[PDB]
């Protein structure tokens, strides 16, 4: 699986896998790992962007809150405003299970782009690396800004601002 799924292998650490979490595993558990990693990166990339915009000031619908750990988790109402969102992500997950039980499917290809590209166009391979490398930088960065607000009071930039 390591030699057929070249996406994710870059110059800083060509196939960085210390601790042997990947050593001698079936495809089905391996394909789970890649589909988990891509899902974590996508959510973290969208969380980072959604956290910076609410932090920077522009929080548009009802004008409620600037710090966005208050806005969501103490303040936004549990009964409906969180129920629906999780329900709406649940229908996307259900839809993606129908996506996964088809022939010729990649570990993380919801759009079904493998119908137009066979992964041997480097530009495709190269662009995919851009998504996943960024996704990786976003997972650590969301954890960095979440601990920063869970513990301290500062929720914005501590490095440049």
């Amino acid at each position: 699986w390591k030699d057929e799924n070249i996406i994710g292998i870059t110059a800083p650490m060509g196939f960085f896998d210390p601790l042997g979490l990947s050593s001698g595993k079936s495809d089905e558990v391996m394909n789970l790992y890649r589909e988990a990693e891509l899902k974590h990166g996508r959510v973290a990339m969208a969380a980072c962007l959604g956290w910076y915009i609410t932090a920077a000031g522009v929080h548009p619908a009802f004008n409620s809150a600037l710090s966005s750990d208050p806005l969501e988790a103490a303040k936004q109402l549990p009964t409906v405003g969180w129920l629906q969102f999780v329900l709406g992500c649940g229908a996307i997950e259900w839809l993606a299970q129908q996506i996964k039980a088809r022939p010729g499917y990649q570990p993380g290809d919801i759009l079904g782009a493998a119908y137009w590209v066979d992964n041997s166009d480097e530009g495709w391979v190269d662009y995919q690396n851009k998504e996943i490398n960024n996704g990786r930088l976003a997972m650590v960065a969301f954890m960095g800004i979440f601990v920063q607000d869970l513990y301290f009071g500062n929720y914005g930039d501590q490095i440049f601002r």
Binding site: I9, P12, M13, G14
Partner: protein
């Protein structure tokens, strides 16, 4: 990571540098230049960029300077300026016995007590602005050569100008020239760090402005 790494075309994994024996020698260093012990722990000589682009842009024509050559040319100019600047900074402070100052009231002790306030004081007056123009003329008349050597049209050594008015080296064996050249470099190196010392201490919270600056 599956291209051919850039660490191989610029690191030479066969020999080792005289300075820092645990690192391999950079490819452009030799024993050829004066004052050389193979010292380049950051592998700067090995950067494959044309640093003559700063003077003339690379889009003007085909052309390329060796990176090592441009560095030596810099290091000589950094040496020469620092040998004079350290010497000139102390001499106007009276570190050699006599407080050496230009004739005239404007450059005397009463208007400028020590060299530390000579840059800001002379900048307002204009004598500083005049020296900027005078250096500017020389730099422009001497930095065009870098272009010639980068076009392969010259066989001039780095930092070499026919400036030997007292004929120190006319007819000296290459062993004699190389040793003399090493003196320009070793004394220049010590004076680059001497000026960095003097300019730094003299600007912290304490620190005097006497001949000794500690």
């Amino acid at each position: 990571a599956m291209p051919e790494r850039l660490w191989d075309s610029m690191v030479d994994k066969t020999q080792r540098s005289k300075a820092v024996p645990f690192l391999p020698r950079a490819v452009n260093l030799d024993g050829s230049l004066p004052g050389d012990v193979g010292f380049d722990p950051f592998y700067l000589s090995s950067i494959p960029k044309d640093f003559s682009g700063f003077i003339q842009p690379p889009q003007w024509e085909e052309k390329g300077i060796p990176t090592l050559y441009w560095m030596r040319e810099a290091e000589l100019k950094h040496s020469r300026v620092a040998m004079l600047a350290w010497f000139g900074w102390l001499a106007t402070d009276g570190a050699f016995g006599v407080t050496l100052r230009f004739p005239g009231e404007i450059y005397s002790v009463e208007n400028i007590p020590t060299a530390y306030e000579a840059h800001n004081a002379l900048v307002s007056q204009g004598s500083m602005g005049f020296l900027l123009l005078a250096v500017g003329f020389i730099e422009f008349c001497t930095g065009a050569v870098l272009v010639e050597v980068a076009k392969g049209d010259s066989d001039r050594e780095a930092g070499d100008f026919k400036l030997d008015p007292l004929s120190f080296l006319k007819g000296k064996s290459e062993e004699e020239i190389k040793r003399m050249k090493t003196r320009e470099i070793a004394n220049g190196r010590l004076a680059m760090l001497a000026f960095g010392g003097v300019a730094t201490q003299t600007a912290l919270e304490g620190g005097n402005h006497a001949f000794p600056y500690f």
